[PDB]
């Protein structure tokens, strides 16, 4: 768990730490922080793994009507919007 060398961002205690390669300093800093608290729910560095009625079957992709809570779901296929709204 480290950062790649060209990275242009903020790493705590980086300016005060010295005398190593950049990736080695970032790995050692991300491993632990005696001075402060590192956040628990983080989302930059992630593990690499390869990319009554009305169920999801009871309709067609041209069906007209009201499906509850399915006007706020976006970027998905119509059956997928209906599936993750109903279930």
């Amino acid at each position: 768990p480290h950062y790649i060398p060209g990275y242009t961002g903020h790493c705590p205690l980086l300016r005060f730490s010295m005398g190593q390669t950049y990736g080695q300093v970032t790995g050692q800093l991300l491993r632990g922080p005696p001075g402060l608290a590192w956040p628990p729910a983080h989302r930059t560095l992630l593990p690499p793994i390869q990319s009554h009625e009305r169920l999801s079957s009871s309709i067609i992709p041209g069906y007209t009507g009201f499906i509850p809570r399915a006007q706020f779901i976006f970027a998905k296929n119509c059956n997928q919007v209906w599936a993750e709204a109903m279930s």
């Binding site: 205690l13 956040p39 983080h42 989302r43 976006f74």
Partner: protein, 425 residues
């Protein structure tokens, strides 16, 4: 990359100190200045508005320029006053006293030789400097008069950077100073020439929002500065948060001002909702475009239905879809097309930022450039020239070191500017 935030005046500190209670809650920073946040994007681009000190602490980039020591002593003892470094609270001894010429010429000119030492110090501790800011009101002589002399001498040292000013221009309805038009008419003589940017906020319409749509019985000067601080951060959120589509501070200044004198804008804010009608309100993309664009929700009291939109922004803030955002900017433009200029065939600028303001699921922020900003400038010059035709209060300025021909020189540049808005209408 990064910005240094100047604050000037008794309005300027009370505008400015609330903004640092706002943007330090973007980044999980407690009042002593230490990060205690809950995500790594609360920390990742924090150097845009900061400098770092020893011990796991960050201090802002701000100087706090006043002409009375008693108006920052409340700011140094607020809830978020001890965050600032006390080296650059550079302050005067005697008062300007609602006087232009005692801020520009006589008294502030001794102080500004010492203000430049720290703003040159905050502008050499950088990586690649991006811009500055300025908070001031166009009524007095501490916020308004020295802040004008501040800008021009920044401009001759750092002439390819970005200057912003967040004005609070004087109102017609009730005036809290007798000599307001002698301030604001000589003031905009250098907001037409010396700055890259300037906004326009009336206190007349900040009252109109805080009674019609927010249902406040009694708004203080804290609830009005909540409205300003939620827009002064909305134009610097592509610069410190990643986006699906990006439009940072330089990208709008090139793109919106069509001609090099017409840089007076009028902002709003979309999810502004009454506390009883928060429950009965849906938040979709059409429910931001419906409330960005309506003439009630402006913060400038210059009615857009009385003129032509020139160039129109929208910096959205949430997790939206790029069709539905681009649909409504097409839908509004085709419905009422008389209100928009026709020799600019699409008056839309769009941006989407992936990190909302905290507590809100979705937001938006608007920057109009309408034709009807001349009715601010015309109605200053109708009540300026009542007083100047008989020379009511002139002896307090002429006795501090300025001539008579400088005022009819200032009435040239303001009454030129009204014509250059009628020219392109």
């Amino acid at each position: 990359r990064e910005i240094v935030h100047l604050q000037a005046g008794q309005c300027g500190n009370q505008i400015g100190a609330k903004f640092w209670e706002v943007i330090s809650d973007e980044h999980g920073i407690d009042p002593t200045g230490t990060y205690h946040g809950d995500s790594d994007l609360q920390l990742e681009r924090i150097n845009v508005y900061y400098n770092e000190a020893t011990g796991g602490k960050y201090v802002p980039r701000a100087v706090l320029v006043d002409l009375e020591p008693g108006t920052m002593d409340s700011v140094r003892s607020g809830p978020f006053g001890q965050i600032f470094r006390p080296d650059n609270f550079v302050f005067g001894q005697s008062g300007a006293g609602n006087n232009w010429a005692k801020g520009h010429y006589t008294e502030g000119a001794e102080l500004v030789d010492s203000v430049l030492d720290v703003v040159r110090k905050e502008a050499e501790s950088c990586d690649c400097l991006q811009g500055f800011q300025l908070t001031h009101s166009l009524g007095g002589g501490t916020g308004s008069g020295m802040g004008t002399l501040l800008i021009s001498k920044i401009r001759e040292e750092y002439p390819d950077r970005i200057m912003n000013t967040f004005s609070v221009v004087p109102s017609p309805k009730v005036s809290d100073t007798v000599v307001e038009p002698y301030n604001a008419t000589l003031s905009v003589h250098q907001l037409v020439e010396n700055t890259d940017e300037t906004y326009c906020i009336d206190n007349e319409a900040l009252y109109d929002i805080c009674f019609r749509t927010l249902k406040l019985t009694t708004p203080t000067y804290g609830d009005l500065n909540h409205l300003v601080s939620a827009t002064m951060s909305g134009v610097t959120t592509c610069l410190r948060f990643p986006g699906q589509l990006n439009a940072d501070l330089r990208k709008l200044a090139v793109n919106m001002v069509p001609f090099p004198r017409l840089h007076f804008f009028m902002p709003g804010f979309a999810p502004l909702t009454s506390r009883g009608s928060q429950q009965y309100r849906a938040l979709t993309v059409p429910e931001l475009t419906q409330q960005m664009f309506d003439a009630k929700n402006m913060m400038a009291a210059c009615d857009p239905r009385h003129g032509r939109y020139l160039t129109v922004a929208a910096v959205f803030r949430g997790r939206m879809s790029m069709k539905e955002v681009d649909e409504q900017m097409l839908n509004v433009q085709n419905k009422n097309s008389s209100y928009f200029v026709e020799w600019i065939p699409n008056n839309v600028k769009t941006a989407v930022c992936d990190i909302p303001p905290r507590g809100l699921k979705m937001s938006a922020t608007f920057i109009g450039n309408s034709t009807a900003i001349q009715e601010l400038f015309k109605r200053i010059s109708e009540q300026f020239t009542a007083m100047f035709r008989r020379k009511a209060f002139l002896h307090w300025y002429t006795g501090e070191g300025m001539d008579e021909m400088e005022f009819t020189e200032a009435e040239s540049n303001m009454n030129d500017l009204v014509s250059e808005y009628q020219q392109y209408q």
